[PDB]
Design a protein around this ligand. Sequence first.
Ligand SMILES: O=C(O)c1ccc[n+]([C@@H]2O[C@H](COP(=O)([O-])O)[C@@H](O)[C@H]2O)c1
Ligand SMILES: O=C(O)c1ccc[n+]([C@@H]2O[C@H](COP(=O)([O-])O)[C@@H](O)[C@H]2O)c1
Ligand SMILES: O=C(O)c1ccc[n+]([C@@H]2O[C@H](COP(=O)([O-])O)[C@@H](O)[C@H]2O)c1
Ligand SMILES: O=C(O)c1ccc[n+]([C@@H]2O[C@H](COP(=O)([O-])O)[C@@H](O)[C@H]2O)c1
Ligand SMILES: O=C(O)c1ccc[n+]([C@@H]2O[C@H](COP(=O)([O-])O)[C@@H](O)[C@H]2O)c1
Ligand SMILES: O=C(O)c1ccc[n+]([C@@H]2O[C@H](COP(=O)([O-])O)[C@@H](O)[C@H]2O)c1
Lengths: 289, 289, 289, 289, 289, 289
Amino acid sequence: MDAEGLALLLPPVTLAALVDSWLREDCPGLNYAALVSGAGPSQAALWAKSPGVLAGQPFFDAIFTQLNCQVSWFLPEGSKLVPVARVAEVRGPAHCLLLGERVALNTLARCSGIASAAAAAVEAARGAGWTGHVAGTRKTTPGFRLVEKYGLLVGGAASHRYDLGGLVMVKDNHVVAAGGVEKAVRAARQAADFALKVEVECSSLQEAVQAAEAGADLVLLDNFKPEELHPTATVLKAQFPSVAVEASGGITLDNLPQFCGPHIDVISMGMLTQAAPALDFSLKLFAKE
Amino acid sequence: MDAEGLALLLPPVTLAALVDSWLREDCPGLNYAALVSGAGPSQAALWAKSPGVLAGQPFFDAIFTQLNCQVSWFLPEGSKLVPVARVAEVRGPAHCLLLGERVALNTLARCSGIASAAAAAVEAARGAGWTGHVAGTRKTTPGFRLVEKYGLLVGGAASHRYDLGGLVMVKDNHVVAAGGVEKAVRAARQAADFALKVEVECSSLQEAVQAAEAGADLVLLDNFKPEELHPTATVLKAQFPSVAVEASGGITLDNLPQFCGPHIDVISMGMLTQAAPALDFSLKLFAKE
Amino acid sequence: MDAEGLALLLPPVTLAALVDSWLREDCPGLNYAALVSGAGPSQAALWAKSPGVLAGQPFFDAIFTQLNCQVSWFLPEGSKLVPVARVAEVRGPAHCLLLGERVALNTLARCSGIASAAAAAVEAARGAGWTGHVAGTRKTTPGFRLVEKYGLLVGGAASHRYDLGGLVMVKDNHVVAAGGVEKAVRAARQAADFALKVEVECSSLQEAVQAAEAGADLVLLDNFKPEELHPTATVLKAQFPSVAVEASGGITLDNLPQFCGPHIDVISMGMLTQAAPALDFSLKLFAKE
Amino acid sequence: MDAEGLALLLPPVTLAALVDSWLREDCPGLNYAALVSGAGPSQAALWAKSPGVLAGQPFFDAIFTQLNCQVSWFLPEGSKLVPVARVAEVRGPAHCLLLGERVALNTLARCSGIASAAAAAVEAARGAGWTGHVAGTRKTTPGFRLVEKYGLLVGGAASHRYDLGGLVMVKDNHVVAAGGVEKAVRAARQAADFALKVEVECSSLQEAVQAAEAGADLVLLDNFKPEELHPTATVLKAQFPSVAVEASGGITLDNLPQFCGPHIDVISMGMLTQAAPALDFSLKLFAKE
Amino acid sequence: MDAEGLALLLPPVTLAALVDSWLREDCPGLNYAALVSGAGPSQAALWAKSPGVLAGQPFFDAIFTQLNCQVSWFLPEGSKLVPVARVAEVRGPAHCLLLGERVALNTLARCSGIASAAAAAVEAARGAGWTGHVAGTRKTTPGFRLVEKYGLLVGGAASHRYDLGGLVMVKDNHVVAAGGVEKAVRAARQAADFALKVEVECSSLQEAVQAAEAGADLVLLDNFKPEELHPTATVLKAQFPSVAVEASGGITLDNLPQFCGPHIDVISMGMLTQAAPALDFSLKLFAKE
Amino acid sequence: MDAEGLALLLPPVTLAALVDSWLREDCPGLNYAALVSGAGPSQAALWAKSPGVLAGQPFFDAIFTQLNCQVSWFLPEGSKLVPVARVAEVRGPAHCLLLGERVALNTLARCSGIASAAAAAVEAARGAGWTGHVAGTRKTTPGFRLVEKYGLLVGGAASHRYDLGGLVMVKDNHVVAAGGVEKAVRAARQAADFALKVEVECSSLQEAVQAAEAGADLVLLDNFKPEELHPTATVLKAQFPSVAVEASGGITLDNLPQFCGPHIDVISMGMLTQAAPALDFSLKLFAKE
Ligand SMILES: O=C(O)c1ccc[n+]([C@@H]2O[C@H](COP(=O)([O-])O)[C@@H](O)[C@H]2O)c1
Ligand SMILES: O=C(O)c1ccc[n+]([C@@H]2O[C@H](COP(=O)([O-])O)[C@@H](O)[C@H]2O)c1
Ligand SMILES: O=C(O)c1ccc[n+]([C@@H]2O[C@H](COP(=O)([O-])O)[C@@H](O)[C@H]2O)c1
Ligand SMILES: O=C(O)c1ccc[n+]([C@@H]2O[C@H](COP(=O)([O-])O)[C@@H](O)[C@H]2O)c1
Ligand SMILES: O=C(O)c1ccc[n+]([C@@H]2O[C@H](COP(=O)([O-])O)[C@@H](O)[C@H]2O)c1
Ligand SMILES: O=C(O)c1ccc[n+]([C@@H]2O[C@H](COP(=O)([O-])O)[C@@H](O)[C@H]2O)c1
């Protein structure tokens, strides 16, 4: 509902340590450019130069907070960005603003790109009349998942499982390793019967039926062509009405409406995190009025 | 030098701490799916399903080494990927293979994705007759710089400075803070006269002349149109022949040939790391004869 | 239904870090006692002097692997301990055996003490004909959760959710802060509709019906005397066949039969981790012959 | 002699680091329940529902300090707890209160459970006229020693050595490795030099005399029957009056008066940290008026 | 030219982490002495008892900020110390002052010792009519480089490169491994043509000419006799006027003037961080009036 | 006694973490020089070019072991170094040898420099007939205390207390804060009666008598002239035969005989760690076949 409340999801203690490692990565030793700018109190304007959705204020704020700077936002989390928009002002000693600048922009750009992709996907789906959830994956940049799942939520998608613990997800490789879908789904059920859910990844109707018989909570139809996707889900919903159907594999902004259908509850797209270009933001010091 | 030599640039201690933190990110508690697959010895085939350049073997290796798995590659680092290619084979306990799969794949996908954009840019420059350096920027994913700068090098681009400690770069914001170009360049030269180089980002020809007169090693012409860019660089090289000229701002694979010019030495592209989609890789367990 | 394979659940990277920090805590500087013992090859015996269930071999093994010692076990993980039993042999340099001894016994004692409480509780419950799950809680020693939740599993109990990122549980305090059960539960269901489960802690029959109406996967009947409990539950399963029922509040080894009932699916006991005395083990060096 | 002033023993850099790891353990990713409570200002009351001694206010405070919450205590550290007592009030944003609640109660229950067991021991020892030190052991939970040693002090017991540094302690296993008591405490005496004391665990009157002859400061008489313990301690003090005698092994709250004696200076019980059940506390949100 | 400005080079995140690691080294567990002093407000005066240069205020300040203490300086950074001077006053709880006393004095004493040695070398060089850069090396105490490089700057020396990332330095061993100087600097030149500098360490005029002819930005003449050093530099400056010339190897304050010469740009000295004795500072609590 | 045994004191968990932080300090990103040397197998000789005592082999081994290099020592830990001497060989890949070279030489140079100062102070006191202990202090480089305390031991000196959790030490500032010598030491005697030692730092003979009378184990006569130090030590020994006497403050190599006396038990010298120059070592790659 409200993109403004999503920030309560982020534990305060994780932000500070996350942010501290990013700052150290960009300046591990002596910050020679501090001598160029000096330490006088300054003001920068944050400028939106790309269209999209604003996501990332919590991480932007945390970065500058460790550098004793303050941020005033002129747009809420989740806003549509119409270029060229003035979206915040940052205040602090000049060398601190310029030290935090690059990391803060990198984070805002990337989080917002993901939310902009997610909002477009949510839009395309509703424009085909589909009421299910658009979702992300675990195809995230390592070390950056907290930012990328947050960005999905701001854009209106579900984050899907955060990590491997999680919901027990039986994949192709698990079926092979366990010697059969029925053995794998039985082993996944025991591993947390109460209460984690079990999702099972299925390359065909007959695997999906076997997964549902063995007790899957969710059935993921993997890499179906749309023309076989919907018949398969119809049979499933008629035979196992309380099992949820997820479609996934090669779904993009463009072909997404072909994968929306009344018997698909969830559509997950790797593109939301692997192919969402970053938005264009700049931070510019200006003289005080 | 040669793409296989590049792996030596990676300090093995940093590799291990990066890899461990990525794994703890994807599985911070219990790995319930390890019960589904068990620990029996298995083999998995790495498949390349996107065209491009293969980059990131050192990280893929270090991920799996930490889980006591081994990798045999069938293509060298920097190889062209012609899909559908069988790129490697991974060996080890089934649960260790499946626990590292996603992290390893996510790393290789983004690293290869960046190397693929760099290769594409170096190609576009060479086909325009340009012998300069195509270069990356500091617009990298927070936490992930080591992989992305490594990706740039495998693709044939220069990484540019690794962080704020490796070359004193006077930007528009330093100029405003310092009171002006020549004040800012003087403080930059002090801050490490011997010996770090000083690069100055300039938005006008006069700003470029002031910076070169003030002793900049490198003058970066920022967001010039090509029609304004090349006459500026010609003037600069005429008056200051030992000052290198860089061009940057809004340069993409498509417009890259318009910015090549006999008086440009470096061309830096934020897009090589911010808008380079990841390649598609899978890892499929295959049965024991 | 096999305690030897539970070790696969422990991610190897989390084990080594945890063990390192335990060894650092017990010896932060110089280890003066190493000079008293020297470094000659030697062997110790592990002695179980308490009845119960043996749990914690992977942690015990990991501690001594960091100290270049080897361990041979004479009883599989989960075995019944009949004192005074010779449980294992540890081999390595004398000072390394004696450096690991206290941390290894401390971990094994507590992991086995918890598994022993868990096994006794599970034994009580099937002796009353019960088929549901005996479970643990988040009343764990801070920083020791991985050992204590693993111990629950070794003794046959369910771990319940590992931390706040598993199933969304709304408690009395959430209901007070949301201003009502059905508000709380409706927010909970949004926060991850697909797919994490939602569990609601209820003090009174009315609350549980509200919770179930609103979409709870699980209702926890908290602090019921067994007199009200089994009516309450058989009502709920009548009205809501599809919703799981959990009993919690003051359930101990002595009174556990009185909470076992046929419409109760899960019984969780904070005593399994808060009042589970450690078993008594010792490690004794013995001479070669 | 003043439990309020013990909090100065805890260095504040360590407290924040330990507290951050505990919070990170209980919520490693997104905190979904935060969307259920919101962030509106709230107050919770701390209820003691158990008899004992109150211990652990600095850790409790430090947890809620990291979460931007305040604590008001109505009982000083060390007070007797008569249930059901209102111990404190915690103020702050509701999600912040609910995120720290479990870890704060977990820490206070264990700390207090220990200080309550210590105070019982000091009560029983005082009831037998014994003026020596009741002390703890190194049988603490790995990772938690700071809380548990502090809890021993709050309840009137001596902590004993914190770690493997501190006093050099010759044990059964050292005597085996060094080939005799004389050799082991001569090597110990050398390592200890002038700053550390030497204590020797002795299971017979012969060992105790050899240890005292070879310069031990303390002799620990290990696993003696009470009838054998007191003559041994007496003859030792006659022959070596400068040597402190400690008794230890199987000493419990019920049998502790039997081990008290005018020639025992220290009595140590693993019981106080390995078998002290945690006190019952709760934290309940309430409406301001 | 301003010692008070150098503090801006220190990124505040790194300061906190480094400072906390030093406090934890000196007090890993309980601070027993805190009971001896109590927590009442106190004041202590910092006393300089050595002649030299004051350096290290940012580290001294940061230690005491972590401990909720405040510092007031009566001398700016880089001041000349004429003993016995009263250079600062520290205010805070009694136990926090005494907790930080030793770490802060150890830090200030080494930093000021390095700055004193650097200023002595600069004064000797200036008394020989030399105005090039006196420079440090990477012969720093491991883990203490930020303090030691900072102290070189306060004293008037150049820090030289901070680590293996600042400038590619071809040493004797690189030459041997590369199979010759031409191959080495060619490879070095490739590692970062634009733009890091390449310095080559040379033991003969012929090696230096080759290093220069092959592209070196700086030539370091290592362990020359002054009699052969100055003719060598004169040749290099005449045939390669843009290449900087460094002298290094065995250069001490007492022999430094013989190494000063019109064609030496940089003189670097291991002894500035390896043979620089610390200064004597004390911190004495004082009372009301 | 035997310096070769002292390596047993070093817990290997701590060595790896220390060493990792030092390597990361010296190369936080890409190691450009690795491309100059390549990765082929190589060898380097370790030369001692300063007189003194060899100390720090375990830290040197650990550095290279982290880089997959092996070290062969030709002299034992603690040897007298008669320059020039071939101390060791190091083998491994060329770029790993050159990556560890500086950190490994820095650690060995400071460790050996400290041991050399220790051995000379021990010999000075032996030549004066004195049988007490020469001791170090806590005037140690922050972060480096393990190497420096270790270096003292290899030189034949006592380390004195490692940190604040060793013996409780009442200093001038503690006396001022407690309001009296004699209330200070009683607070200190409580803070760990059994069993840590109490040392009191005294400026006058009356102060020593009060510390002795209130129960100090050790009395440090701080900054006495030798003329008054020995009369004072004699009174104390006569009145308090079991109290040990330390002498400290301004004691150097050349006046150490003046502080030796029959009633001084310990002499401690800040200069052993604050004014002990590092020894000169070099590591030289040499070609094979
Ligand atoms: O591991 C997960 O949590 C997870 C959640 C949702 C989807 N996936 C997988 O992500 C893949 C998405 O494919 P794509 O083409 O959109 O990159 C598909 O193979 C799914 O099985 C994986
Ligand atoms: O800070 C650096 O290391 C750096 C190196 C090269 C380029 N840049 C900046 O990157 C910008 C180019 O970004 P883009 O997205 O327009 O390709 C340009 O404005 C430069 O100032 C920055
Ligand atoms: O937060 C959890 O994960 C959780 C899981 C299971 C149970 N609990 C709570 O644990 C409590 C059990 O109390 P007790 O007497 O068994 O210590 C009961 O009040 C439940 O609400 C809490
Ligand atoms: O290592 C220590 O610091 C230490 C301090 C005091 C006692 N102990 C040992 O702890 C044992 C007491 O265990 P318990 O649970 O039987 O009372 C006994 O064998 C002592 O030698 C060990
Ligand atoms: O690696 C560096 O950054 C570096 C910078 C400047 C000098 N050095 C080396 O330092 C050595 C001089 O140190 P010293 O103790 O002989 O005065 C000489 O051999 C140089 O090669 C090394
Ligand atoms: O704090 C310690 O553990 C410690 C141990 C031994 C000596 N000291 C102090 O070291 C000081 C002697 O330093 P110095 O530089 O004059 O040789 C003297 O003032 C003692 O109080 C301090």
